[PDB]
Design a protein around this nucleic acid. Structure first.
Ligand SMILES: Cc1cccc(C)c1N(CC(=O)Nc1ccc(-c2ncon2)cc1)C(=O)C1CCS(=O)(=O)CC1
Ligand SMILES: [Zn+2]
Lengths: 318, 244, 550, 145
DNA sequence: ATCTGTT
């Protein structure tokens, strides 16, 4: 998901932001821009942050594409689905921003590895260091950059891998998991994936506290026009991510007005549904607390009121 | 029969033992390709008859005699744990010795006496086929009964069993944590409560698969409506959330 | 469709999430937070008669409903939106939740509530309810109810405290969180920057040290003494480690999900005089919260309560009206009794294995279940209308003779024939409750000298090709596959088989499947030997098979 | 009204009885149908309660209740059957007295607008209850639609 | 009458 920094105070009207986003998602596949700053994220939840809903993805590194060849490679990756080779990521990687994320992790891993019971009491002639001086020196001598991570990986690879596999829980899932959770429809597989995983937490509207089933239900009534494509994805190809990445990147729901108006529709639909649900619930609760009858009549009223509010025909009309 | 009667393909392919993940992945991918291709050719050659043909596959030599399985030595095959929400089918029993089950019995259970006595006279293992069709051998059930009298503890007895049960009949109490499909209830006239009938009547999805030996509503039953009044009075509370 | 069946549920669980999140963020005062010295005092105790009156803060949210409601579909939204710990009263409840949670987005392995507060295998034999307690208050306070529950559960409570404190290197304060906090202070970092990474670097810490919202499913099967055990163990494990949430002055929030009408708690005691087992009905966790006046006003249960009033497993009009009458305790009328007469049949009709084949017979006693089971097995032999072979398997119980002397010495009763002791304890030595529903033969006892044991053996009758359940956690080693070709193809195409296995035998699983695939060949021509198959097709298959082989 | 429009219309007892060429009015119209059905009732009683079978070899029918959705007829042992009254089918009381147990046939409408015939009993022994009607079994009479 | 925690 691509965006630009606002700068302005009052967030543009819904149509203004729709227009701004529609021109960013060019109708051919390539975003409009000369320089890009791409944060690569895996699944997982960050720790120590307080928000309405917990996070779904977690950044791992940051790259900047500004050169013509780098920008061309990124556009090819975003438009068709061709993988990015490690050379480009190593050349465009932003070290300062990348290693600010893996800053406290190195310290925690160093403390855990070095946490063997200390004594700091050898005394002798010149063998007496302070109780807290040992950890102070260890942290002072630890480089919170590529050096420290490289050393930890070289010497303690198993521990580092185990620790990193727990900060990014669920980061290793197969193509079938993605197809089943967010699919099987193309529109769902694209829009719901992008919203639930990436845009819901960044935008932080009223739809950031709705689960994946609710988001798929909302996407069901996003009944924008279709345009049959030649062929779809199939099994025996889900052993790799290449086929699904090509299928999703080259979709018509990934650019233009289709991809520019789903986040807006989510909020519109949620507000419209709540507008009716709240009023009906208020009516039901007011009548619930003042009805003076009997248990049989009270149960009759409860179920009759809920049927009158939410019988299948009324839900279909709504 | 014709000259080609034994699937000569074997005379040309020799799969060696596995190696590091790279070697293992290469072997599995090629074998899966070969297996599907033969399936495609035979399916193309015949069609549905090949699809529903009886089939089997085992790592070692296994012979099923009556209710028993005969095998040389069960070695290899991934270990796992049997679930409680799973449905299995009892295929038979076996006397083939498994080192993994025996060695752990030595490990987890500090009682070597039971380990040696069981080793001298071993008990058969139960062979189960899961829903998908994988034969499994399940370890025995050993429980240690330690009695606490005045905080004095003593593991006096051990019980070795199989730990399997059948859904053909149970008590009404054990059915309150279960979901059933067809239920036939046998109430006792006189030792009857209105809440035992509510629990037994609601184990199924439809009333077309429900039978009872008497009408619990027409007989003398015990009623305890203490919780029901609390639930009913919460439905009149403006602060309680009611969700349909 | 599937979009309007979740409309009423997805817009109504939002008020629930707002309250639960608000409850989980409330901060205590420094004087109310239980101190690590509280649990050191308990660990230095011999009888529960010296317990001081102390209060352990906590909060609750109730989510109740019938067994067909979507009250467990409300935990899939709490799990995806909130950071909580989902548990189960039993092992089946923990496995049903994982299927629902893992089948929606994702979930970690789900355990029982006994595994999370440290319940081990030696606590399954403790005798509960010995020491007497009297509530010295007409409107009993929380400290009075909490100390009553700590005295009933004293045998397990004392053991858990001793293991927790003793296992901490003795006096050595646990360094998992203290080491990072000291480094955090020295380096001048934001509070909680490093201490919240301890769970990742240390992968053996309990789940009670990572969150304060605890979700228990099927809380109606739990005794009322278990509300304090969870609250007393959450504070013990956080005070011991000094976790980031303990230092923030937060309290545990227990979200209790269950059905208060179709589920009950059971309490059983052993009398060593008549060698008798007594079972009575006790108060469960849900009834404790809803009925007790002190607990109901302390927890403000009128604001922390949600009721689900749907039933997805009832699409029949007249049957749904009978379930509503039974749940809410409405008067029974004559039109309800007329409706129920459809399902009545003679008792001899139900207790006849030849009738209603494949149905589950529900009895009230264990002797009736055993009596019918024997009849079924006998009928499955003689008639042979469909075969269904029946076989018997051996079972052995090894009774130690020195311990029996110790037990016999402590409680006299010299004779105490091992047969009579084993008969009386039949409901205790076993691991599962269905041991008494089995079809077993005559009981025989013998004495084995030298090794100094008493071995008792019996036989149990089973049916081949029948549907059984494994009522225990037993490891199984697979060695083959048995079915049709279409069944085999489906398993290999999807890697979900490998995923179900742990992330340590994937190479082993691939090797095992690779080994099975190689030996799974042949027999294609035995299938080709089917009567009247073909003449030219057989040769075409050979040529095609060779072509594919080449 | 909502239940009628949602779950569908249900047939009353009069229409179901008419489908069997029987009318609840006139008294004898339903007695004839009960007599035609009595063979199946007696066969079931013999099959499941063989001990209490001679009591139902010559039994006359007599109406007891004629509500809109429930009909209850009595089974009177004509005039000569050896045993004076009928005996309880559920328990074996202290022999001697027959523990007077009035026997009834109850007609109602079951699922799919079918006719349900149930056997009911009233026992005057304190153990059973008296003042209470007990259902022994229910059978289907929908074979002759 | 009567279940379940370990595993
Ligand atoms: C209430 C409702 C709302 C919307 C749509 C429908 C379909 C309904 N239902 C279905 C329903 O209530 N099912 C149910 C069955 C059992 C239990 C139960 N089990 C144990 O305890 N409770 C609880 C709910 C009705 O039945 C209406 C039908 C028309 S009406 O007559 O105007 C009101 C009831
Ligand atoms: Zn009687």
């Amino acid at each position: 998901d691509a965006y630009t920094h606002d700068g302005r105070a009052d967030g543009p009207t819904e149509q203004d932001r729709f227009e701004e986003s529609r021109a960013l998602y060019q109708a051919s596949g390539g975003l409009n821009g000369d320089s890009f700053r791409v944060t690569f994220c895996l699944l997982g939840t960050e720790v120590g942050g307080t928000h309405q809903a917990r996070g779904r993805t977690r950044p791992m590194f940051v790259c900047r594409f500004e050169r013509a060849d780098d920008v061309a490679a990124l556009q090819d990756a975003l438009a068709h689905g061709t993988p990015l080779q490690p050379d480009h990521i190593a050349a465009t990687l932003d070290a300062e921003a990348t290693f600010a994320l893996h800053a406290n992790m190195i310290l925690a891993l160093t403390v855990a590895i070095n946490n063997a019971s200390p004594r700091t009491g050898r005394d002798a002639a010149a063998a007496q260091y302070d109780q807290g001086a040992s950890l102070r020196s260890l942290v002072g001598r630890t480089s919170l950059g590529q050096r420290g991570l490289t050393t930890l990986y070289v010497h303690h690879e198993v521990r580092v891998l185990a620790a990193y596999r727990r900060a990014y829980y669920g980061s290793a899932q197969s193509p079938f998991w993605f197809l089943s959770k967010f699919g099987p429809d193309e529109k769902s597989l694209v829009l719901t994936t992008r919203y639930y995983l990436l845009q819901a937490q960044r935008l932080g509207g009223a739809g950031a506290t709705y689960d994946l089933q609710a988001i798929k239900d909302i996407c069901a009534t996003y009944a924008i026009p279709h345009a049959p494509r030649p062929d779809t994805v199939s099994a025996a190809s889900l052993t790799s991510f290449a086929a699904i990445t090509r299928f999703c990147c080259t979709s018509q729901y990934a650019r233009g007005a289709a991809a520019a108006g789903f986040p807006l529709y989510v909020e519109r639909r949620i507000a419209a549904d709540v507008r009716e649900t709240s009023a009906l619930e208020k009516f039901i609760t007011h009548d619930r607390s003042c009805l003076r009858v009997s248990d049989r009549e009270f149960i009759t009223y409860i179920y009759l009121a809920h049927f009158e509010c939410f019988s299948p025909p009324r839900l279909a009309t709504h | 029969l014709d000259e080609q009667q034994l699937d000569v393909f074997y005379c040309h392919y020799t799969p060696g033992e596995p190696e590091t993940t790279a070697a293992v992945h290469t072997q599995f991918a090629l074998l899966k390709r070969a297996f599907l291709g033969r399936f495609r050719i035979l399916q193309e050659l015949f069609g549905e008859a090949f699809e529903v043909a009886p089939f089997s596959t085992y790592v070692d030599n296994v012979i099923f005699r009556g209710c028993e399985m005969l095998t040389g030595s069960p070695r290899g095959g991934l270990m796992s744990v049997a679930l409680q929400t799973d449905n299995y089918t009892l295929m038979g029993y076996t006397y083939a010795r498994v080192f993994a089950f025996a060695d752990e019995l030595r490990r987890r259970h500090a009682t070597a006496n039971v380990a040696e006595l069981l080793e001298e006279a071993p008990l058969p293992y139960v062979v189960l086929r899961d829903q998908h069709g994988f034969m499994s051998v399940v370890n025995t059930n050993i429980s240690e009964f330690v009695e606490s009298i005045d905080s004095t503890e003593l593991a006096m007895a051990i019980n070795a069993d199989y730990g399997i049960s059948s859904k053909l009949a149970m008590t009404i109490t054990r059915s309150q944590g279960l979901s059933l499909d067809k239920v036939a209830i046998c109430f006792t006239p006189g030792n009857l409560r209105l809440n035992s009938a509510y629990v037994a009547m609601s184990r199924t999805t439809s009333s077309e698969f429900l039978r009872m030996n008497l009408n619990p509503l027409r007989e003398r039953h015990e009623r305890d409506d203490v919780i029901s009044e609390h639930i009913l009075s919460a439905l009149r509370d403006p602060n309680v959330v009611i969700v349909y | 469709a599937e979009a309007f069946l979740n409309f009423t549920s997805m817009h109504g669980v939002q008020p629930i999430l707002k309250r639960i999140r608000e409850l989980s963020q409330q901060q205590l005062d420094g004087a109310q937070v239980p101190h690590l010295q509280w649990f050191r005092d308990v660990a230095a105790l011999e009888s529960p008669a010296g317990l001081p009156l102390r209060e352990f803060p906590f909060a609750v949210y109730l989510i109740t409903g019938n067994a067909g409601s979507g009250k467990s579909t409300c935990v899939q939204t709490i799990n995806e939106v909130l950071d909580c710990v989902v548990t189960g009263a039993t092992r089946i409840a923990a496995q049903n939740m994982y299927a629902k949670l893992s089948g929606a987005f994702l979930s970690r392995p789900i355990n029982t509530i006994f595994h999370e507060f440290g319940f081990r295998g030696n606590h399954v034999q403790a005798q509960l309810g010995q020491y007497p307690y009297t509530l010295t208050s007409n409107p009993a306070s929380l400290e009075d109810l909490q100390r009553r529950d700590l005295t009933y559960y004293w045998e397990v409570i004392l053991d858990l405290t001793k293991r927790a404190l003793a296992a901490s290197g003795g006096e050595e304060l646990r360094n998992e969180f203290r080491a990072l906090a000291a480094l955090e202070r020295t380096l001048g970092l934001a509070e909680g920057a490093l201490t919240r990474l301890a769970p990742a670097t240390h992968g053996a810490l309990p789940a009670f040290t990572r969150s304060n919202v605890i979700v228990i499913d099927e809380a109606g099967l739990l005794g009322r003494h278990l509300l304090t055990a969870v609250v007393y163990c959450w504070w013990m494990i956080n005070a011991l480690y000094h976790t980031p949430q303990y230092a923030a002055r937060l309290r545990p929030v227990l979200v209790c999900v269950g059905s208060p009408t179709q589920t009950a708690s059971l309490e059983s005691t052993f009398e060593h005089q008549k060698l008798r087992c007594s079972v009575r009905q006790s108060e469960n966790v849900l009834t404790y919260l809803i009925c007790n006046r002190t607990l109901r006003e302390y927890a403000r249960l009128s604001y922390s309560w949600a009721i689900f009033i749907n039933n997805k497993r009832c699409v029949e009009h007249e049957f749904g009206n009978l379930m509503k009458v039974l749940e809410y305790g409405l008067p029974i009328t004559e039109e309800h009794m007329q409706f129920v007469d459809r399902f009545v049949v003679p008792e001899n009709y139900i207790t006849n294995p030849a009738n209603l084949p494949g149905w589950t017979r529900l009895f009230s006693s264990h002797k009736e279940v055993s009596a019918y089971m024997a009849k079924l097995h006998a009928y499955l032999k003689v008639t042979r209308e469909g075969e269904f072979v029946v076989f018997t398997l051996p079972v052995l119980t090894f009774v130690s003779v020195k311990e029996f002397d110790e037990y016999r010495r402590l409680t006299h009763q010299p004779g105490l024939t091992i047969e009579k002791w084993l008969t009386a304890n039949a409901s205790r030595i076993t691991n599962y409750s269905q041991s008494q529903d089995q079809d077993a033969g005559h009981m025989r006892c013998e004495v084995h000298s030298k090794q100094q044991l008493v071995v008792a053996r019996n036989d149990v009758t089973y049916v081949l090709n029948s549907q059984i359940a494994v009522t225990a956690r037993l490891r199984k080693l697979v060695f083959g596959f048995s079915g049709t070709f279409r069944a085999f193809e489906a398993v290999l195409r999807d890697d979900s088989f490998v995923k179900t296995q742990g992330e340590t035998s994937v190479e082993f699983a691939y090797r095992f499947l690779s080994r099975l695939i190689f030996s799974g060949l042949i027999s294609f021509y035995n299938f080709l030997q089917r009567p009247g198959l073909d003449a030219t097709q057989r040769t075409l298959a050979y040529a095609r098979m060779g072509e594919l082989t080449a | 009204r909502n239940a009628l429009e949602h779950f569908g219309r249900r047939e009353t007892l009069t229409e179901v009885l008419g489908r069997y060429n029987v009318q609840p009015d006139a008294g004898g119209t339903v007695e004839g149908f009960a007599s035609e059905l009595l063979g199946r009732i007696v066969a079931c009683i013999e099959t499941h309660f063989p001990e209490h079978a001679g009591e139902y070899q010559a039994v006359s029918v007599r109406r007891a209740v004629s509500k809109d959705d429930w009909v209850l007829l009595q089974l009177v042992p004509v005039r000569g059957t050896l045993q004076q009254s009928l005996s309880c089918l559920r328990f074996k009381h202290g022999r001697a007295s027959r523990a007077t147990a009035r026997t009834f046939v109850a007609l109602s409408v079951g699922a799919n607008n079918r006719l349900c015939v149930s056997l009911c009993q009233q026992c005057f022994a304190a153990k059973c209850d008296s003042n209470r009607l007990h259902t022994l079994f229910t059978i289907d009479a929908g074979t002759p639609c």
